[PDB]
Design a protein around this ligand. Structure first.
Ligand code: HEM
Ligand code: HEM
Ligand SMILES: c1ccc2[nH]cnc2c1
Ligand SMILES: c1ccc2[nH]cnc2c1
Lengths: 137, 137
């Protein structure tokens, strides 16, 4: 289930983080408006750009902590507030998050593993509602 | 305290994992006997390989699972048994683990980051005694 999936992802986290983030950028190419340094690059080129790997791993280190602290796929209010208040996230609205989690769930369903894809769909929806409550537009 | 330290380490796990493993190898150069593939390389030579990082981070992920499942810094017997039974750990003894945790606590005390060094010292001692109870020499 959801708790096991956190363990699965954490067991190969840099690889999953990069592959899921690439699936997001390739499903929604207009979302690169938020990531201008990644324009004009193939997947293999991005996987040899130092900030793409280092930043995307740090994103997923925190995402897995937020998931682990959740109850029945509902995150802590303190975690939602951190995500809204972060200076890096100043330009963002909740649609940006909705699209990230749509891409993550699609990746899981296509992997041919045993991910609990439906719980990740709930977690993304419940994180969006918590972000709205914490003041994201 | 101990629970916050797990969150600090996971937030930047690949960087902490590399720096603590290098502190261990530099404190106890004879322990590099267990790691023939790292002979004849400086710190920055080892880190220049994205694989050294991949591999070391997977080690520290398991360490953090065992730490988070502990009660009052006493690991589960079943987690000690996993570490004894791993094929890659055949022909280790408890002294190898003792040295690792001495280096880890020394790194935490020298760092600018607040860590509960006394809890990690207890965890390492209690892990050694659990390894012995699960059949390590
Ligand atoms: C639960 C979901 C998310 C988590 C846990 C998360 C976490 C983070 C973290 C930790 C950083 C700092 C990385 C670093 O500089 O080392 C960051 C930066 C950033 N985040 Fe997020 N984030 C999430 C969702 C999003 C989404 C949906 C977008 C946009 C579609 C986004 C856009 C950014 C941008 C533009 C930066 C700064 C640029 C960069 O680091 O390359 N984030 N985020
Ligand atoms: C709580 C402590 C420890 C944990 C969590 C741990 C975890 C791991 C894991 C997960 C692997 C497999 C990595 C992979 O294949 O991707 C591994 C392999 C290995 N471990 Fe440990 N380990 C611990 C302590 C030690 C100690 C103390 C030594 C020796 C001083 C050691 C020596 C090895 C060796 C030789 C391998 C195989 C070769 C290598 O991975 O470089 N381990 N360990
Ligand atoms: C998901 C994927 C990559 C990211 N980079 C910064 N925040 C992110 C969220
Ligand atoms: C500590 C540091 C590096 C390691 N590699 C394999 N097991 C380990 C324990």
């Amino acid at each position: 289930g959801f708790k096991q999936d956190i363990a699965t992802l954490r067991g190969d986290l840099r690889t999953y983080a990069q592959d899921i983030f690439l699936a997001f950028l390739n499903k929604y190419p207009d979302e690169k408006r938020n990531f201008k340094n990644y324009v004009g690059k193939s997947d293999q080129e991005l996987k040899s750009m130092a900030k793409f790997g280092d930043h995307t791993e740090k994103v997923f280190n925190l995402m897995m902590e937020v998931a682990d602290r959740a109850t029945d796929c509902v995150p802590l209010a303190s975690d939602a507030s951190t995500l809204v208040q972060m200076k890096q996230h100043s330009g963002l609205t909740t649609g940006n998050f909705e699209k990230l989690f749509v891409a993550l769930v699609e990746y899981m369903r296509a992997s041919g593993q045993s991910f609990d894809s439906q719980s990740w769909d709930r977690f993304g929806k419940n994180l969006v509602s918590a972000l709205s409550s914490a003041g994201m537009k």
